[PDB]
Structure 1
Amino acid sequence: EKILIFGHQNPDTDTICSAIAYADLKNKLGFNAEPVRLGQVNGETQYALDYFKQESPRLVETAANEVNGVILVDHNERQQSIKDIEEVQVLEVIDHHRIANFETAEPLYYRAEPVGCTATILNKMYKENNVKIEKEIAGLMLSAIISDSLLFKSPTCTDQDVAAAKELAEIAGVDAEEYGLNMLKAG
């Protein structure tokens, strides 16, 4: 019944913030999720956490000693994932990358979209579930999109990512450019 949600090894802002955000969505719907991380938080992500007054996810090396099932955000390939990923069931994946080095024994909820950031997809999922995005969660989701898009300069950034960042900046109460440049400079 408890599940862990995490992104990839060598975490980036999307991998930390999308784990926290998806755990919030799961918990606001009555489930039992803890967001965790697989490595050290970098200076860009730490700026986001500090700014929006959010705790760092707990660091884990393995999952099977804790839970039976996990959710992956921002990755799918086994070599990017937790070291004992073969010993737990992947219940869901929310991601924006190519699929490789990944198989399941059972059906699952797999949601990949060809957008520039996982948090763009989570924005969609909050709205599909009629769950309000709290100011600080919006700030973390905005941070993820700024990070993965290089402040909207990456060709991986789509109109969906820009539209999500506009929504989330309004919710978070920040100017995306001013906040984004400070966040990126902290990294």
Structure 2
Amino acid sequence: SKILVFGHQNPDSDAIGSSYAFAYLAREAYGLDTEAVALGEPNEETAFVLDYFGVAAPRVITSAKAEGAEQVILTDHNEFQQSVADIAEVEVYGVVDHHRVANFETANPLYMRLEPVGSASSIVYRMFKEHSVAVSKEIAGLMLSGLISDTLLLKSPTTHPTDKAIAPELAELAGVNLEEYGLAMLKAGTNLASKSAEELIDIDAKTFELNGNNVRVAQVNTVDIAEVLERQAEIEAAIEKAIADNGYSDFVLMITDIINSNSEILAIGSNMDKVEAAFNFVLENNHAFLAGAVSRKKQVVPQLTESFNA
């Protein structure tokens, strides 16, 4: 049976790029019978990436067992609630990630390669180099895009020196001008006007279990926070519906200005006091400004984890 390689639910560019690239690396370098798949359709930014390099989106699955798989390799995630529905029924052969670890356990030893760098694609690319496996233009393009996507063109505080070193290498392999391509790709993911309120709050959203509470943290990239706030009423309605249908304790939406590097936080839930403590602010009409925030893994999750536990 093939070993399925995939990123998290609501995959982003890095999730798609890292799983596609690692599935290939695992075949060439480790002789594993892998297959890259996805848990969701590409969102707009990734659609731009796939079209630019001429790569088909990995097929979407809903059950690892239904595919006949016995083993899986996770990229860009490790928390079970962010993975395939029946993740508990298959063996986790390996994990390549750059996120915090939680709600993850195995009965047996496994392979894990985690680094606190800008993207999982960055880790995968460096693994290509260490194993002397040639990187095609298409794979370079997808990995480069994952890196650019997750670090907002190397300016996010999650950007590691090693990310800055490999970006130009990947751009060369991908046949693109790093800044020219990067800016175009990032802009492709800021067209929120084409999305309904219910769609926008689930484009890039993950669930975190904080002290027994299921907290949904969503993020959207924009070039104008004010414009998004003009739709506050409809967004709040969508959020309330999401909370009711999924049983979340709280919903935190990051409206991220990727040009100026700040996020307006729109939150609704039963633990707003914990949200305010985490962000050192006071919500007014369900929102407040979080200066300098662009990263969920570095500027939202650690803080919420701490506030919910104390």
Bucket of the pairwise TM-score, normalised by the shorter protein? over 0.9
Equivalent residue runs for 1:85-100 within 5 Å = 85-100=87-102
**Under a length normalisation based on structure 2, what TM-score does the superposition of the two structures give?**
0.59
The unaligned stretches of length 5 or more in structure 1 are: none
**Under a length normalisation based on structure 1, what TM-score does the superposition of the two structures give?**
0.97
Distance in 2 between the 1:139 and 1:48 partners?
Answer: 8
- Per mean C-alpha deviation after superposition, the further-off stretch among 25-34 and 125-134 is 25-34
The answer for the alignment partner of 1:27 in structure 2 is 27
Equivalent residue runs for 1:132-143 within 5 Å = 132-143=134-145
SS of the aligned residue for 2:135 comes to coil
| CA deviations over 1:97-134 (Å, ceiling 9, x no partner) | 11100000100001101101001111111112110111
Report if aligned partners of 2:50, 2:142 keep a CA contact under 8 Å in 1.
Answer: yes
The answer for the alignment partner of 2:8 in structure 1 is 8
The answer for the alignment partner of 2:304 in structure 1 is none
SS of the aligned residue for 1:178 comes to helix
Distance in 1 between the 2:166 and 2:150 partners?
Answer: 13
Distance in 2 between the 1:83 and 1:31 partners?
Answer: 24
The answer for the alignment partner of 2:62 in structure 1 is 61
Report if aligned partners of 2:3, 2:72 keep a CA contact under 8 Å in 1.
Answer: yes
Distance in 2 between the 1:31 and 1:87 partners?
Answer: 21
SS of the aligned residue for 2:37 comes to strand
What residue identity is the alignment partner of 1:79?
A: Q
Q: What is the Cα deviation at residue 27 of structure 1?
A: 2.3
The answer for the alignment partner of 1:146 in structure 2 is 148
What residue identity is the alignment partner of 2:132?
A: N
CA RMSD of superposed structures (Å): 0.9
Higher relative contact order (CA 8 A, sep 6+): 1
The answer for the alignment partner of 1:44 in structure 2 is 45
The unaligned stretches of length 5 or more in structure 2 are: 190-310
- Per mean C-alpha deviation after superposition, the further-off stretch among 27-36 and 124-133 is 27-36
Distance in 1 between the 2:129 and 2:41 partners?
Answer: 31
Distance in 1 between the 2:115 and 2:32 partners?
Answer: 24
| CA deviations over 1:7-48 (Å, ceiling 9, x no partner) | 000110000010100011122233211111111211100111
The answer for the alignment partner of 1:76 in structure 2 is 78
What residue identity is the alignment partner of 2:125?
A: N
Q: What is the Cα deviation at residue 85 of structure 1?
A: 0.2
- How many matched pairs? 187
Q: What is the Cα deviation at residue 93 of structure 1?
A: 0.1
1:130 aligned to which of 132, 147, 157: 132
More strand by percentage: 2
| CA deviations over 1:154-185 (Å, ceiling 9, x no partner) | 10011111111111011111001111111111
Identity of aligned residues (%): 58
SS of the aligned residue for 1:9 comes to coil
- Per mean C-alpha deviation after superposition, the further-off stretch among 30-39 and 108-117 is 30-39
Distance in 2 between the 1:179 and 1:9 partners?
Answer: 26
The answer for the alignment partner of 1:162 in structure 2 is 164
